[PDB]
Amino acid sequence: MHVAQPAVVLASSRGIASFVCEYASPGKATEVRVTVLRQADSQVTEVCAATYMMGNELTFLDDSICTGTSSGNQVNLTIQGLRAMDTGLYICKVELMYPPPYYLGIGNGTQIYVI
Amino acid sequence: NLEEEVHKLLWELSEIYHHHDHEASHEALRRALEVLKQLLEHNNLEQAVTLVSIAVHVAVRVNDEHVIRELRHFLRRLLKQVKEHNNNKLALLVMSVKMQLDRT
C-alpha cells in the first residue's frame, strides 16, 4: 500500500512539527493503526503509535510527544517537545486492521529539522 | 498456491485479531509460520513482511510463547535477507515488527 508524506518539514521556533500522512486505503477500512518511526542516522526508534477509527481524532498509546487528527485517507500528526537532537527522518507506517484483510504501507519518511 | 495462502491468512489473522479469538489463532499461527517459512526460501519478502507483521500482532495478544519464540527466529532471518537486498523500506518494516515482538 502506498503512503505519502512531505519530503521535508521544519520545526517551528517551538519544535512542533506538523505533517500529513496519506494512505491509499483499499476502498474504505475501519481500524487503522499509524506508527511513526524515527531513523537517525542508522538508528530506528518508535516515536509514537495510535489506533484510531478512519474518521476521528487519534487516540495515542504514548499519549505524549504525538497528537493527531484524521480526515478520510489521511492523518495530520503533530509532534511536540522537539529539540535539535530529535532531528531525523520520521516515517509513517500505516496498517489497516479491520475489516479484513490486513494491509500494510510505509511512506518514504519526512525529514524533520529542529533548531 | 502460496500467494492465495497468504491472502487467506491476511484475512483470517485480521478477523482473529479483531475477534480476539484465542484458539483459531493457534492453528492460523501455525499455518502462518510455515507459509512464512516457504516465503523465505523462495525470496518473496513483500508477502513475508506483511504476513509476519499481522501475525506478530495476533501472537502477542493471544500470548503463544511457542509462536513468539519461532517468530523471534524468523524475524532475524527475514531482516538479514532484507538487508542483503538493501531494501531500506522493508528493513524499517521488519525492524518495527521486531521492536514490538522483541519486548512484549
PDB file of C-alpha atoms in Angstrom:
ATOM      1  CA  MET A   1       0.000   0.000   0.000  1.00  0.00           C
ATOM      2  CA  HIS A   2       1.204   3.490  -0.917  1.00  0.00           C
ATOM      3  CA  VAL A   3       1.766   6.039   1.860  1.00  0.00           C
ATOM      4  CA  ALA A   4       2.724   9.658   1.139  1.00  0.00           C
ATOM      5  CA  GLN A   5       4.195  12.364   3.375  1.00  0.00           C
ATOM      6  CA  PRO A   6       6.106  15.623   2.832  1.00  0.00           C
ATOM      7  CA  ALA A   7       9.782  15.262   1.955  1.00  0.00           C
ATOM      8  CA  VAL A   8      10.994  17.917   4.420  1.00  0.00           C
ATOM      9  CA  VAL A   9       9.353  19.714   7.355  1.00  0.00           C
ATOM     10  CA  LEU A  10      10.756  22.434   9.614  1.00  0.00           C
ATOM     11  CA  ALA A  11      10.021  22.548  13.317  1.00  0.00           C
ATOM     12  CA  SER A  12       8.629  25.883  14.444  1.00  0.00           C
ATOM     13  CA  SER A  13      10.584  28.151  16.781  1.00  0.00           C
ATOM     14  CA  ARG A  14       8.964  25.910  19.392  1.00  0.00           C
ATOM     15  CA  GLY A  15       9.777  22.468  17.949  1.00  0.00           C
ATOM     16  CA  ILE A  16       6.246  21.487  16.935  1.00  0.00           C
ATOM     17  CA  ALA A  17       6.216  19.728  13.576  1.00  0.00           C
ATOM     18  CA  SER A  18       3.093  19.001  11.566  1.00  0.00           C
ATOM     19  CA  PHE A  19       2.800  16.778   8.521  1.00  0.00           C
ATOM     20  CA  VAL A  20       0.061  14.888   6.712  1.00  0.00           C
ATOM     21  CA  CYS A  21       0.345  11.156   6.034  1.00  0.00           C
ATOM     22  CA  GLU A  22      -1.958   9.810   3.333  1.00  0.00           C
ATOM     23  CA  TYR A  23      -2.670   6.144   2.697  1.00  0.00           C
ATOM     24  CA  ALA A  24      -4.348   4.629  -0.360  1.00  0.00           C
ATOM     25  CA  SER A  25      -6.975   2.876   1.727  1.00  0.00           C
ATOM     26  CA  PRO A  26      -8.355  -0.079  -0.285  1.00  0.00           C
ATOM     27  CA  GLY A  27     -11.880   1.186  -0.612  1.00  0.00           C
ATOM     28  CA  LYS A  28     -12.733   2.005   2.988  1.00  0.00           C
ATOM     29  CA  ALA A  29     -11.273   0.431   6.129  1.00  0.00           C
ATOM     30  CA  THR A  30     -12.325   0.882   9.764  1.00  0.00           C
ATOM     31  CA  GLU A  31      -9.442   0.159  12.165  1.00  0.00           C
ATOM     32  CA  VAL A  32      -6.247   1.987  11.135  1.00  0.00           C
ATOM     33  CA  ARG A  33      -3.019   1.834  13.165  1.00  0.00           C
ATOM     34  CA  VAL A  34      -0.425   4.531  12.411  1.00  0.00           C
ATOM     35  CA  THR A  35       3.152   4.235  13.684  1.00  0.00           C
ATOM     36  CA  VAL A  36       5.781   6.967  13.400  1.00  0.00           C
ATOM     37  CA  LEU A  37       9.355   5.678  13.250  1.00  0.00           C
ATOM     38  CA  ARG A  38      12.429   7.896  13.504  1.00  0.00           C
ATOM     39  CA  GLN A  39      15.529   6.939  11.506  1.00  0.00           C
ATOM     40  CA  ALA A  40      18.643   8.890  12.518  1.00  0.00           C
ATOM     41  CA  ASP A  41      21.198   8.077  11.410  1.00  0.00           C
ATOM     42  CA  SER A  42      21.076   4.305  11.123  1.00  0.00           C
ATOM     43  CA  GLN A  43      19.147   4.193  14.411  1.00  0.00           C
ATOM     44  CA  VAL A  44      15.469   3.251  14.344  1.00  0.00           C
ATOM     45  CA  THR A  45      13.094   4.091  17.189  1.00  0.00           C
ATOM     46  CA  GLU A  46       9.314   4.138  17.515  1.00  0.00           C
ATOM     47  CA  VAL A  47       8.254   7.713  18.248  1.00  0.00           C
ATOM     48  CA  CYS A  48       4.526   7.073  18.687  1.00  0.00           C
ATOM     49  CA  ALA A  49       1.699   4.766  17.693  1.00  0.00           C
ATOM     50  CA  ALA A  50      -2.064   5.119  17.686  1.00  0.00           C
ATOM     51  CA  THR A  51      -5.039   3.035  16.644  1.00  0.00           C
ATOM     52  CA  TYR A  52      -7.964   5.192  15.544  1.00  0.00           C
ATOM     53  CA  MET A  53     -11.123   4.774  13.508  1.00  0.00           C
ATOM     54  CA  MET A  54     -10.714   6.159   9.995  1.00  0.00           C
ATOM     55  CA  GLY A  55     -12.587   9.379  10.666  1.00  0.00           C
ATOM     56  CA  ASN A  56     -11.989  10.557  14.230  1.00  0.00           C
ATOM     57  CA  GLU A  57      -9.363  12.078  16.435  1.00  0.00           C
ATOM     58  CA  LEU A  58      -6.339   9.901  17.156  1.00  0.00           C
ATOM     59  CA  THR A  59      -6.171   8.044  20.474  1.00  0.00           C
ATOM     60  CA  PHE A  60      -2.449   7.715  21.071  1.00  0.00           C
ATOM     61  CA  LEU A  61      -0.885   4.977  23.182  1.00  0.00           C
ATOM     62  CA  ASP A  62       2.062   7.013  24.473  1.00  0.00           C
ATOM     63  CA  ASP A  63      -0.418   9.945  24.809  1.00  0.00           C
ATOM     64  CA  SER A  64       2.673  12.172  24.741  1.00  0.00           C
ATOM     65  CA  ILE A  65       5.032  13.709  22.172  1.00  0.00           C
ATOM     66  CA  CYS A  66       2.472  12.950  19.437  1.00  0.00           C
ATOM     67  CA  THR A  67      -1.012  14.316  18.783  1.00  0.00           C
ATOM     68  CA  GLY A  68      -3.058  13.641  15.667  1.00  0.00           C
ATOM     69  CA  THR A  69      -6.271  14.124  13.728  1.00  0.00           C
ATOM     70  CA  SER A  70      -7.718  12.060  10.885  1.00  0.00           C
ATOM     71  CA  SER A  71      -9.732  13.098   7.829  1.00  0.00           C
ATOM     72  CA  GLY A  72     -10.512  10.403   5.282  1.00  0.00           C
ATOM     73  CA  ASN A  73      -7.490   8.518   3.976  1.00  0.00           C
ATOM     74  CA  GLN A  74      -5.072  10.974   5.602  1.00  0.00           C
ATOM     75  CA  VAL A  75      -3.907  11.828   9.123  1.00  0.00           C
ATOM     76  CA  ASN A  76      -2.257  15.053  10.302  1.00  0.00           C
ATOM     77  CA  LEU A  77       0.264  14.250  13.034  1.00  0.00           C
ATOM     78  CA  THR A  78       1.674  16.930  15.337  1.00  0.00           C
ATOM     79  CA  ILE A  79       4.822  16.186  17.340  1.00  0.00           C
ATOM     80  CA  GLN A  80       5.688  18.435  20.290  1.00  0.00           C
ATOM     81  CA  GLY A  81       8.671  18.974  22.563  1.00  0.00           C
ATOM     82  CA  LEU A  82      11.254  18.617  19.789  1.00  0.00           C
ATOM     83  CA  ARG A  83      14.889  19.525  20.404  1.00  0.00           C
ATOM     84  CA  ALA A  84      17.715  19.746  17.875  1.00  0.00           C
ATOM     85  CA  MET A  85      18.753  16.198  18.820  1.00  0.00           C
ATOM     86  CA  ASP A  86      15.367  14.852  17.626  1.00  0.00           C
ATOM     87  CA  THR A  87      16.165  15.853  14.017  1.00  0.00           C
ATOM     88  CA  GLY A  88      15.789  12.886  11.696  1.00  0.00           C
ATOM     89  CA  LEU A  89      13.643  11.043   9.184  1.00  0.00           C
ATOM     90  CA  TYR A  90      10.109  10.492  10.522  1.00  0.00           C
ATOM     91  CA  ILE A  91       8.499   7.660   8.546  1.00  0.00           C
ATOM     92  CA  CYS A  92       4.797   6.744   8.536  1.00  0.00           C
ATOM     93  CA  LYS A  93       3.832   3.082   8.858  1.00  0.00           C
ATOM     94  CA  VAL A  94       0.097   2.591   8.318  1.00  0.00           C
ATOM     95  CA  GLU A  95      -1.809  -0.633   8.984  1.00  0.00           C
ATOM     96  CA  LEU A  96      -5.405  -1.464   8.102  1.00  0.00           C
ATOM     97  CA  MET A  97      -6.517  -3.801  10.892  1.00  0.00           C
ATOM     98  CA  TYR A  98     -10.278  -4.139  10.329  1.00  0.00           C
ATOM     99  CA  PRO A  99     -12.360  -5.032   8.301  1.00  0.00           C
ATOM    100  CA  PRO A 100     -10.282  -7.863   6.780  1.00  0.00           C
ATOM    101  CA  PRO A 101      -7.908  -8.345   5.103  1.00  0.00           C
ATOM    102  CA  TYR A 102      -4.886  -6.800   6.824  1.00  0.00           C
ATOM    103  CA  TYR A 103      -2.890  -4.256   4.822  1.00  0.00           C
ATOM    104  CA  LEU A 104       0.488  -2.629   5.389  1.00  0.00           C
ATOM    105  CA  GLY A 105       2.042   0.531   3.983  1.00  0.00           C
ATOM    106  CA  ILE A 106       5.151   2.587   4.751  1.00  0.00           C
ATOM    107  CA  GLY A 107       5.968   6.099   3.489  1.00  0.00           C
ATOM    108  CA  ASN A 108       9.396   7.259   2.461  1.00  0.00           C
ATOM    109  CA  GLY A 109       9.678   9.458   5.520  1.00  0.00           C
ATOM    110  CA  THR A 110       9.544  13.130   6.456  1.00  0.00           C
ATOM    111  CA  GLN A 111      12.880  14.825   7.134  1.00  0.00           C
ATOM    112  CA  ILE A 112      12.120  16.979  10.191  1.00  0.00           C
ATOM    113  CA  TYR A 113      14.704  19.629  11.112  1.00  0.00           C
ATOM    114  CA  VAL A 114      14.767  21.196  14.587  1.00  0.00           C
ATOM    115  CA  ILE A 115      16.608  24.368  15.571  1.00  0.00           C
TER     116      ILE A 115
ATOM    117  CA  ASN B   1      -0.822 -21.639  -4.479  1.00  0.00           C
ATOM    118  CA  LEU B   2       1.132 -19.826  -1.754  1.00  0.00           C
ATOM    119  CA  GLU B   3       0.005 -16.378  -2.938  1.00  0.00           C
ATOM    120  CA  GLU B   4      -3.554 -17.368  -2.053  1.00  0.00           C
ATOM    121  CA  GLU B   5      -2.498 -18.938   1.266  1.00  0.00           C
ATOM    122  CA  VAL B   6      -1.153 -15.547   2.357  1.00  0.00           C
ATOM    123  CA  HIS B   7      -4.363 -13.980   1.021  1.00  0.00           C
ATOM    124  CA  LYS B   8      -6.459 -16.239   3.269  1.00  0.00           C
ATOM    125  CA  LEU B   9      -4.197 -15.721   6.290  1.00  0.00           C
ATOM    126  CA  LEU B  10      -4.191 -11.930   5.927  1.00  0.00           C
ATOM    127  CA  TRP B  11      -7.985 -12.197   6.010  1.00  0.00           C
ATOM    128  CA  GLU B  12      -8.057 -14.774   8.813  1.00  0.00           C
ATOM    129  CA  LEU B  13      -5.491 -13.123  11.090  1.00  0.00           C
ATOM    130  CA  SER B  14      -7.297  -9.792  10.733  1.00  0.00           C
ATOM    131  CA  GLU B  15     -10.575 -11.430  11.770  1.00  0.00           C
ATOM    132  CA  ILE B  16      -8.768 -13.226  14.593  1.00  0.00           C
ATOM    133  CA  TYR B  17      -7.087 -10.021  15.804  1.00  0.00           C
ATOM    134  CA  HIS B  18     -10.357  -8.089  15.771  1.00  0.00           C
ATOM    135  CA  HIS B  19     -12.174 -11.093  17.162  1.00  0.00           C
ATOM    136  CA  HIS B  20      -9.714 -11.656  19.940  1.00  0.00           C
ATOM    137  CA  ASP B  21     -10.016 -15.342  19.087  1.00  0.00           C
ATOM    138  CA  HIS B  22      -7.614 -17.402  21.141  1.00  0.00           C
ATOM    139  CA  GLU B  23      -7.620 -20.864  19.534  1.00  0.00           C
ATOM    140  CA  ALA B  24      -8.465 -20.019  15.958  1.00  0.00           C
ATOM    141  CA  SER B  25      -5.141 -18.202  16.382  1.00  0.00           C
ATOM    142  CA  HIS B  26      -3.227 -21.384  17.292  1.00  0.00           C
ATOM    143  CA  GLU B  27      -3.814 -23.181  14.002  1.00  0.00           C
ATOM    144  CA  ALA B  28      -3.815 -19.980  11.946  1.00  0.00           C
ATOM    145  CA  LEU B  29      -0.476 -19.040  13.509  1.00  0.00           C
ATOM    146  CA  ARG B  30       0.992 -22.476  12.784  1.00  0.00           C
ATOM    147  CA  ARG B  31      -0.109 -22.155   9.168  1.00  0.00           C
ATOM    148  CA  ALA B  32       1.360 -18.649   9.119  1.00  0.00           C
ATOM    149  CA  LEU B  33       4.748 -19.923  10.359  1.00  0.00           C
ATOM    150  CA  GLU B  34       5.004 -22.470   7.550  1.00  0.00           C
ATOM    151  CA  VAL B  35       3.694 -20.098   4.869  1.00  0.00           C
ATOM    152  CA  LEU B  36       6.219 -17.557   6.162  1.00  0.00           C
ATOM    153  CA  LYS B  37       8.839 -20.302   6.089  1.00  0.00           C
ATOM    154  CA  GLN B  38       8.081 -21.043   2.491  1.00  0.00           C
ATOM    155  CA  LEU B  39       8.133 -17.346   1.610  1.00  0.00           C
ATOM    156  CA  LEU B  40      11.672 -17.008   2.983  1.00  0.00           C
ATOM    157  CA  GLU B  41      13.064 -19.925   0.967  1.00  0.00           C
ATOM    158  CA  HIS B  42      11.670 -18.500  -2.292  1.00  0.00           C
ATOM    159  CA  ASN B  43      12.797 -14.911  -1.547  1.00  0.00           C
ATOM    160  CA  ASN B  44       9.284 -13.412  -1.638  1.00  0.00           C
ATOM    161  CA  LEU B  45       9.848 -10.878   1.118  1.00  0.00           C
ATOM    162  CA  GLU B  46       6.958  -8.485   0.466  1.00  0.00           C
ATOM    163  CA  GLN B  47       4.421 -11.158   1.364  1.00  0.00           C
ATOM    164  CA  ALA B  48       6.678 -12.201   4.248  1.00  0.00           C
ATOM    165  CA  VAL B  49       6.852  -8.711   5.753  1.00  0.00           C
ATOM    166  CA  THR B  50       3.090  -8.163   5.509  1.00  0.00           C
ATOM    167  CA  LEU B  51       2.206 -11.631   6.802  1.00  0.00           C
ATOM    168  CA  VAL B  52       4.636 -11.643   9.715  1.00  0.00           C
ATOM    169  CA  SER B  53       3.536  -8.125  10.694  1.00  0.00           C
ATOM    170  CA  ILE B  54      -0.097  -9.018  11.375  1.00  0.00           C
ATOM    171  CA  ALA B  55       0.916 -12.479  12.621  1.00  0.00           C
ATOM    172  CA  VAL B  56       3.041 -10.831  15.325  1.00  0.00           C
ATOM    173  CA  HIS B  57       0.040  -8.684  16.266  1.00  0.00           C
ATOM    174  CA  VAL B  58      -2.026 -11.835  16.818  1.00  0.00           C
ATOM    175  CA  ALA B  59       0.821 -13.712  18.537  1.00  0.00           C
ATOM    176  CA  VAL B  60       1.385 -11.062  21.228  1.00  0.00           C
ATOM    177  CA  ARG B  61      -2.290 -10.621  22.104  1.00  0.00           C
ATOM    178  CA  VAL B  62      -3.034 -14.341  22.285  1.00  0.00           C
ATOM    179  CA  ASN B  63       0.315 -14.956  24.086  1.00  0.00           C
ATOM    180  CA  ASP B  64       1.627 -18.098  22.348  1.00  0.00           C
ATOM    181  CA  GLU B  65       5.215 -18.184  23.638  1.00  0.00           C
ATOM    182  CA  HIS B  66       5.987 -21.040  21.244  1.00  0.00           C
ATOM    183  CA  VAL B  67       4.902 -18.938  18.259  1.00  0.00           C
ATOM    184  CA  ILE B  68       6.688 -15.871  19.674  1.00  0.00           C
ATOM    185  CA  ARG B  69       9.940 -17.827  20.025  1.00  0.00           C
ATOM    186  CA  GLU B  70       9.573 -19.216  16.497  1.00  0.00           C
ATOM    187  CA  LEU B  71       8.810 -15.679  15.300  1.00  0.00           C
ATOM    188  CA  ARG B  72      11.883 -14.339  17.112  1.00  0.00           C
ATOM    189  CA  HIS B  73      13.962 -16.648  14.912  1.00  0.00           C
ATOM    190  CA  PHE B  74      12.123 -15.999  11.637  1.00  0.00           C
ATOM    191  CA  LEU B  75      12.311 -12.219  12.139  1.00  0.00           C
ATOM    192  CA  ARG B  76      16.083 -12.476  12.390  1.00  0.00           C
ATOM    193  CA  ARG B  77      16.421 -14.392   9.144  1.00  0.00           C
ATOM    194  CA  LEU B  78      13.886 -12.172   7.495  1.00  0.00           C
ATOM    195  CA  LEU B  79      15.770  -8.995   8.491  1.00  0.00           C
ATOM    196  CA  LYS B  80      19.067 -10.489   7.269  1.00  0.00           C
ATOM    197  CA  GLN B  81      17.710 -11.241   3.790  1.00  0.00           C
ATOM    198  CA  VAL B  82      16.086  -7.802   3.569  1.00  0.00           C
ATOM    199  CA  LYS B  83      19.381  -6.100   4.453  1.00  0.00           C
ATOM    200  CA  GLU B  84      21.200  -8.028   1.717  1.00  0.00           C
ATOM    201  CA  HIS B  85      18.792  -6.629  -0.895  1.00  0.00           C
ATOM    202  CA  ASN B  86      19.354  -3.119   0.570  1.00  0.00           C
ATOM    203  CA  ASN B  87      15.579  -2.525   0.668  1.00  0.00           C
ATOM    204  CA  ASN B  88      15.521   0.107   3.407  1.00  0.00           C
ATOM    205  CA  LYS B  89      11.713   0.310   3.485  1.00  0.00           C
ATOM    206  CA  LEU B  90      11.383  -3.410   4.060  1.00  0.00           C
ATOM    207  CA  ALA B  91      14.117  -3.224   6.732  1.00  0.00           C
ATOM    208  CA  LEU B  92      12.338  -0.409   8.578  1.00  0.00           C
ATOM    209  CA  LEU B  93       9.245  -2.572   8.119  1.00  0.00           C
ATOM    210  CA  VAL B  94      10.853  -5.671   9.645  1.00  0.00           C
ATOM    211  CA  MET B  95      12.558  -3.749  12.460  1.00  0.00           C
ATOM    212  CA  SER B  96       9.340  -2.107  13.662  1.00  0.00           C
ATOM    213  CA  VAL B  97       7.859  -5.605  13.824  1.00  0.00           C
ATOM    214  CA  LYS B  98      10.981  -6.730  15.682  1.00  0.00           C
ATOM    215  CA  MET B  99      10.608  -3.875  18.191  1.00  0.00           C
ATOM    216  CA  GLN B 100       7.120  -4.803  19.391  1.00  0.00           C
ATOM    217  CA  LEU B 101       8.000  -8.515  19.283  1.00  0.00           C
ATOM    218  CA  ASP B 102      11.418  -8.053  20.909  1.00  0.00           C
ATOM    219  CA  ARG B 103       9.928  -6.967  24.192  1.00  0.00           C
ATOM    220  CA  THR B 104       6.447  -7.583  24.646  1.00  0.00           C
TER     221      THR B 104
END
